[PDB]
Each structure stands twice: as structure tokens, then as C-alpha cells.
Amino acid sequence: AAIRKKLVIVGDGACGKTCLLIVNSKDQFPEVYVPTVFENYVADIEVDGKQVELALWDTAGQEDYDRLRPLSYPDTDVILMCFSIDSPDSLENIPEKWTPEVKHFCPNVPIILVGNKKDLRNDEHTRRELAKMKQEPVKPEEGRDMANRIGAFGYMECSVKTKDGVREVFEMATRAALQA
Ligand SMILES: Nc1nc2c(ncn2[C@@H]2O[C@H](COP(=O)(O)OP(=O)(O)O)[C@@H](O)[C@H]2O)c(=O)[nH]1
Numbered sequence: 001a002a003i004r005k006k007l008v009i010v011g012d013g014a015c016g017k018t019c020l021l022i023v024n025s026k027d028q029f030p031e032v033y034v035p036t037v038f039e040n041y042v043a044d045i046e047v048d049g050k051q052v053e054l055a056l057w058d059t060a061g062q063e064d065y066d067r068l069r070p071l072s073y074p075d076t077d078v079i080l081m082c083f084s085i086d087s088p089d090s091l092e093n094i095p096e097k098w099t100p101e102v103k104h105f106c107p108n109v110p111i112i113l114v115g116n117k118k119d120l121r122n123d124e125h126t127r128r129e130l131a132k133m134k135q136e137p138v139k140p141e142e143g144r145d146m147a148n149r150i151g152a153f154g155y156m157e158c159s160v161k162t163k164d165g166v167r168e169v170f171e172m173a174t175r176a177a178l179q180a
């Protein structure tokens, strides 16, 4: 049968985690807001002639969920660790919060660092809202640097809005999950 692997997605609230999982649904998603996918979603990825089924586990990044979140970690095969390119704060929390949490609960599990919302890097409204506080969108080189700092298997940028990069995120996650 297909190889069975578990993926968990983590990162600050609002950085696009749930949308990144939902893009792998064959069904049109209804016009509702869900903090976390609460049904059993699976990504069917073929890599190197191998059929893999990736169980996708969503999490809530907010501090109030810190005690419940580790219940999602048992037997994880790959982590998608997300920040948003429109949120320098979300990148700052990668080494400060997400990296030590997942290394504790998921020792030796490969991490794919994902910069979501790539479409906002050049977005005029985003640039203005960050610029007013003397900030700017995350640059690709900052994501690469952070992947090195945290020991990630890779760094990828994607936009669920435009779909650019989404395929590579799940293909890389699958290749990472297959290494163990
Ligand atoms: N511009 C843009 N917005 C996005 C993208 N992905 C998600 N969003 C928006 O970001 C908000 C948070 O997304 P969500 O998946 O709920 O984030 P989560 O809290 O990390 O699960 C939602 O309003 C989405 O519409 C993206 O790639 N580009």
C-alpha cells in the first residue's frame, strides 16, 4: 500500500497554516472560518515513483493553546514550520518559540521552514502597513538564514492565494518524511 506519513504544521496565528493544508482538498472549501482543520485531511504525493499518504495535522499557534498543542505531536514524520512574509514578528517567533517546542516534542523530525503569503511581498497595502512602523516584508535571504539557524531541512516560499510554491512545499515535506 501507500507509505503512511504524518505531517504537523505549526507557526504563529494568522500566518496561513490552515489555508496551506486546505489547498490539498479535492472538495471546494465552504466560506467559513476554521482555526484548525478538524477533519482528517490527507495529501497524496508521488515522489520518485513512490505513493505517499500524508496525514495533515493542523495546530493553533496562540499562547492560550500552548498546553493542548503538544497532543498533536506524537509520531510526527515531518514538520511544516510557517511564518508569513508580511509579518516580521512571525519570523522572529521561529527561533524563539516554534523551534524549541518542536525539537522537544518531535526530536530528529525534519523541519521544512515555509514563508507563506509570498504574494504580499510586493503588495502595496502590505508595504504601507509595515512601512508606517519602519518595517518591511521578510526578504528571501532572511528565510534562508533562518533555515540555517534552526537546522531546517529546507526553506520554501509559497502563496496559497496565487498557488505559487505550494507544490514544492508538500513535495519537499514528503521527501523529508521519507528519509528516516
Ligand atoms: N494574501 C494572502 N493571504 C493569505 C494567504 N494564505 C492565507 N491568507 C489569509 O491569511 C489569513 C489567515 O490564514 P489561516 O490559514 O487561517 O492562518 P492560520 O491562523 O495560520 O491557520 C486568512 O484570512 C487568509 O485568507 C496567502 O498566501 N496570501
Ligand SMILES: [Mg+2]
Binding pocket: 017, 018, 019, 034, 035, 036, 037, 058, 059
Ligand atoms: Mg488555522
